Amino acid sequence: NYLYRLFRKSKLKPFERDISTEIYQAGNKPCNGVAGPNCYSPLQSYGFR
Amino acid sequence: GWIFGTTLDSKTQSLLIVNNATNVVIKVCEFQFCNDPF
């Protein structure tokens, strides 16, 4: 259930929030809403055990 | 009033400082229908 964001193009100014989710792209070809090759999900579960 | 935001589109967050003749003058919520009002 607990989630964190590990992919962002820029940094964060202090005391700010971001609740949006998308499909991250780090290449020339855009993802266009498709989570396939070179298309990462920026929000990843911790997986606490 | 003045409408603040980055991209609107119900993706980022916005701000909706307005003004009227009533007592509740400021109403800040996540809205997308406020495009060009009058």
Q: List residues bridging with A25 in a β-sheet.
A: A39
Which residue of A19, A21, A22, A23 to mutate against B (max B Cβ within 10 Å)? A19
Q: Show Cβ contacts of residue A1 under 8 Å, excluding neighbours closer than 6 positions.
A: A45
Taking the C-alpha atoms of B7, B13, B18 and B22 in order, what is their torsion angle to the nearest 10 degrees? 150
Cα–Cα distance, A40 to B32 (Å, whole number)? 28
Cα–Cα distance, B32 to B8 (Å, whole number)? 6
Q: Which residues in chain B are contacts of A19 at CB distance < 8 A? A: 13
This entry's atomic model was obtained through cryo-EM
CB atoms A19 and B13 under 8 Å? yes
Question: Resolution of the deposited coordinates, in angstroms?
Answer: 3.3
- B15, amino acid identity: L
Cα–Cα distance, B7 to B21 (Å, whole number)? 29
